[PDB]
């Protein structure tokens with residue numbers, strides 16, 4: 001906490017973010033000195049496309065519930081770790097290359113986490129484990145080559161998961177086993193050659209899946225599970241136009257539909 005009144009711009013050294021705070025507080029200048037009681041009044045921050053390089057100071061905003069920081073130049077989110085009241089965190093289009101272990105462990109009220117269009121290469125084991133109220137996780141347009149074993153296991157409330165436009169080489173065995181509420185799963189535009197046997201079997205609520213634009217390896221017998229699953233659930237598979245398209249999972253090399261192959 002801030003113990004003595006202090007200029008907005010000292011607490012929030014990034015010029016653009018200090019201006020966000022000033023406007024939210026209805027203060028007249030970023031040189032105005034502010035109190036912790038004033039900072040306690042902030043219930044959300046909506047600062048998309050604002051050239052923000054740093055959110056240093058945000059740690060003094062304990063009551064922030066909705067945080068939208070899309071389209072800035074953020075490379076560190078250390079300062080968010082204490083924002084225990086956060087329910088929506090939108091970090092689209094920043095320059096995060098990693099998530100330090102633990103960064104989200106106190107964010108237990110989070111319902112939606114949007115990490116689209118960052119440069120995340122990998123995730124630490126258990127990074128999402130405390131996000132037990134999470135319903136929407138969006139990791140699309142990152143650089144992920146793998147997922148940790150068990151990374152979604154604690155996210156039993158998850159209803160949408162978007163992994164599209166990464167470079168996933170494989171999925172861990174069992175990775176979706178706890179996701180019994182998941183309705184919408186996007187895996188399109190990755191580098192998947194295969195999925196684990198049974199990988200969709202616990203997805204009792206699944207209504208929509210995207211599998212297109214992966215270089216599926218249709219060699220037998222490896223492809224049997226996927227081919228069988230698509231045929232059994234053909235109405236669930238969608239293309240990029242959003243239409244029902246079970247043939248949109250294609251064999252790399254032959255180009256024919258995965259679901260046409262009988263081992």
Ligand SMILES: [Mg+2]
Pocket residue numbers: 135136159
């Ligand atoms: Mg929802």
